[PDB]
Design a protein around this ligand. Structure first.
Ligand SMILES: O=C(O)[C@@H](Cc1ccccc1)[C@H]1CCNC1
Length: 87
């Protein structure tokens, strides 16, 4: 058996609710500008599902990511694995 939650391709299609980074930090809400001010917002990325603080990939990084709630760490890849391509 595989995982319950995972991304496919580069994860631009990911619409799950994972909200922690590879180091366990909490993702910052996309609509919030604190601790990090940014432009990965629906104004610029209207198709990308930038909702709550869920891991997403609006700008075609290699895998899903988020800004973090740690003021010293702007962004990280999320703690999300790639869905098995095969059985
Ligand atoms: O830090 C950011 O907001 C951007 C890059 C950026 C830095 C400075 C100015 C504009 C863009 C990253 C987040 C993950 N993908 C690109």
């Amino acid at each position: 058996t595989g995982v319950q939650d995972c991304y496919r391709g580069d994860g631009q299609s990911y619409r799950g609710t994972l909200s922690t980074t590879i180091t366990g930090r909490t993702c910052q809400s996309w609509s919030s500008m604190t601790p990090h001010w940014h432009r990965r917002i629906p104004l610029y990325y209207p198709n990308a599902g930038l909702t709550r603080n869920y891991c997403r990939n609006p700008d075609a990084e290699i895998r899903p990511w988020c800004y973090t709630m740690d003021p010293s760490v702007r962004w990280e890849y999320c703690n999300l694995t790639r869905c098995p391509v095969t059985e």
